[PDB]
Amino acid sequence: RSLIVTTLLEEPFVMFRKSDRTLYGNDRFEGYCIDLLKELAHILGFSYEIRLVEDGKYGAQDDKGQWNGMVKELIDHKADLAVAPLTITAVREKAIDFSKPFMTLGVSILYRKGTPIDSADDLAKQTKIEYGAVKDGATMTFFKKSKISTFEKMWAFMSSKPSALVKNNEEGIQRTLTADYALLMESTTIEYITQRNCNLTQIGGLIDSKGYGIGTPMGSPYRDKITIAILQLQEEDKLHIMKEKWWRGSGC
Amino acid sequence: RSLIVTTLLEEPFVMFRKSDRTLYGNDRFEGYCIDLLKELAHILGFSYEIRLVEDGKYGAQDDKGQWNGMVKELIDHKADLAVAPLTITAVREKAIDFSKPFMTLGVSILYRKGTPIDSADDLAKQTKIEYGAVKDGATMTFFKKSKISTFEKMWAFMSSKPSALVKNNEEGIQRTLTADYALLMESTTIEYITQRNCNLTQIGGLIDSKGYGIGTPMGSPYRDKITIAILQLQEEDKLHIMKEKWWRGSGCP
Ligand SMILES: C=C(C)[C@H]1CN[C@H](C(=O)O)[C@H]1CC(=O)O
Ligand SMILES: C=C(C)[C@H]1CN[C@H](C(=O)O)[C@H]1CC(=O)O
Ligand SMILES: [Cl-]
Ligand SMILES: [Cl-]
Numbered sequence A: 001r002s003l004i005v006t007t008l009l010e011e012p013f014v015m016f017r018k019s020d021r022t023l024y025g026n027d028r029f030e031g032y033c034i035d036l037l038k039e040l041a042h043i044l045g046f047s048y049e050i051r052l053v054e055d056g057k058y059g060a061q062d063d064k065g066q067w068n069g070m071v072k073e074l075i076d077h078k079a080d081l082a083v084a085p086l087t088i089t090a091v092r093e094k095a096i097d098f099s100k101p102f103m104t105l106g107v108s109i110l111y112r113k114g115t116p117i118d119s120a121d122d123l124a125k126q127t128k129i130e131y132g133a134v135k136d137g138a139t140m141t142f143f144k145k146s147k148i149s150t151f152e153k154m155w156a157f158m159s160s161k162p163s164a165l166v167k168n169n170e171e172g173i174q175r176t177l178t179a180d181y182a183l184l185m186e187s188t189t190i191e192y193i194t195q196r197n198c199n200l201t202q203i204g205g206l207i208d209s210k211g212y213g214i215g216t217p218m219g220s221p222y223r224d225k226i227t228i229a230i231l232q233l234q235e236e237d238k239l240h241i242m243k244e245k246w247w248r249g250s251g252c
Numbered sequence B: 001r002s003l004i005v006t007t008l009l010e011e012p013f014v015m016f017r018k019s020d021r022t023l024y025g026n027d028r029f030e031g032y033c034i035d036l037l038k039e040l041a042h043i044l045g046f047s048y049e050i051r052l053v054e055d056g057k058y059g060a061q062d063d064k065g066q067w068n069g070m071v072k073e074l075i076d077h078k079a080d081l082a083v084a085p086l087t088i089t090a091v092r093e094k095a096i097d098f099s100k101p102f103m104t105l106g107v108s109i110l111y112r113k114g115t116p117i118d119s120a121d122d123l124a125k126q127t128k129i130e131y132g133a134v135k136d137g138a139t140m141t142f143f144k145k146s147k148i149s150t151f152e153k154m155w156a157f158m159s160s161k162p163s164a165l166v167k168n169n170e171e172g173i174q175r176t177l178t179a180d181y182a183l184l185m186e187s188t189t190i191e192y193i194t195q196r197n198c199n200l201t202q203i204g205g206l207i208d209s210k211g212y213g214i215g216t217p218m219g220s221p222y223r224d225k226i227t228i229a230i231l232q233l234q235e236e237d238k239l240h241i242m243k244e245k246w247w248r249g250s251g252c253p
């Protein structure tokens, strides 16, 4: 029957479609994840209703070990699928069932062009340029629990200045534009921003290796079917075209 | 009880360990996948027995849909785990339960250095340079089902001369060394070969994006446990160090 699909707004994955008419239901949304959900609903033959997550969060754990965001929706069996740039992490995989990744990525640095910073070590060995990440995101949680010396130096920097942690990508991008601040952001979002903001660039390569997956409740019968469908999309280059359609900007 | 682990020999993943004593059991084997297998047993707390797959094949389907190799071992519940460079494909994922990939890779070209070839289009636009892939492998299945014009053209060439398809990576490497032949090989194996034979090189980038996974029987309780352990190993850069250990060589200039 109809699956409840939890998600949230994040360019270019899930966005509100601009129109002169008032949009209702699933017609309100467009983006990479919306196209991916349409492909899956057709290959697997199911209908769905898209519902934005109320708190607008992806999924993090509090002091009592309770989750929030889309991860909490899947745990409480209030949603059947989560289509969003939801990073596959070991701690999240213990709570929900991730499909195999439909997109691979890694953490990198976003900062303005013309800067003596070339790697992550350059940001760690100085203080004039502030840096941070989205609070309670997969990138921040990666640095908080990391044991590599270079990243803990960064975590000490982020944990000392609470301002360094931004609320969302929008605040992080604007602070990179207005102040001497470099945002630790996932590589796929960097590609999107740089082709559209011709003053921002990527600094260094990818420091780690992660992927975006589609969340399901633990034990869901759709997880493996979606995984097989995602793999079929990969082998026929459908995800390559799907990304190129949503990542190309007005050039620089 | 001890989990049966099926595998096969493939450098540098699974190799015979050299020793002055005659080795028995799991002590006979070493390599990337053996190190990965030891870490998983340490994190998940299980014992295991390594058994080389008898037919020496990874896993392919015939016309009737019947499997062979390690994939057949997991289907028939004759092995509990499959630790090897087993490429995650949709057709294989329909038969067994893959863990999430511990290594990402793609299809590229292995060929001699002195050639004005730069991309897959250069191989398609000629016929004197023979090319192919391992028969019944994941790379061959990629070209057979491709709809991109360049990749369809190469598959027609491979289907024309059945000799072009080699039996294994060794025969394909040896043919690349002895003849005017370019082997379509997975990128991880190319990195290993190029650092040791300074006449072979990688041509162009990655044609697709796939990963090596650990196979389990359909419905196995260890699949998600192994996935979580692999994700934990990934977040600590342990798989990166593990690769650099077995992927080093001399380093051709
Ligand atoms: C945009 C946000 C807050 C999300 C997107 N993927 C990560 C996640 O799924 O947690 C977050 C970014 C990051 O942590 O670098
Ligand atoms: C070494 C061999 C024959 C294996 C390794 N992974 C692929 C597989 O799992 O099918 C094969 C290589 C290839 O297809 O080019
Ligand atoms: Cl929007
Ligand atoms: Cl999985």
Ligand SMILES: [Cl-]
Residues within 6 Å of the ligand: A160, A161, A162, A163, A164
């Ligand atoms: Cl502060």
Ligand SMILES: [Cl-]
Residues within 6 Å of the ligand: B009, B014, B015, B016
């Ligand atoms: Cl050997």
Ligand SMILES: [Zn+2]
Residues within 6 Å of the ligand: A042
């Ligand atoms: Zn339809």
Ligand SMILES: [Zn+2]
Residues within 6 Å of the ligand: A077, A217
């Ligand atoms: Zn339920």
Ligand SMILES: [Zn+2]
Residues within 6 Å of the ligand: A237, A240, A241
């Ligand atoms: Zn393509």
Ligand SMILES: [Zn+2]
Residues within 6 Å of the ligand: A244
């Ligand atoms: Zn393209």
Ligand SMILES: [Zn+2]
Residues within 6 Å of the ligand: B038, B039, B042, B043
């Ligand atoms: Zn260990």
Ligand SMILES: [Zn+2]
Residues within 6 Å of the ligand: B042
């Ligand atoms: Zn330990």
Ligand SMILES: [Zn+2]
Residues within 6 Å of the ligand: B076, B077
């Ligand atoms: Zn059985």
Ligand SMILES: [Zn+2]
Residues within 6 Å of the ligand: B077, B217
């Ligand atoms: Zn069994």
Ligand SMILES: [Zn+2]
Residues within 6 Å of the ligand: A207, A208, B237, B240
């Ligand atoms: Zn690394």
Ligand SMILES: [Zn+2]
Residues within 6 Å of the ligand: B240
């Ligand atoms: Zn390194």
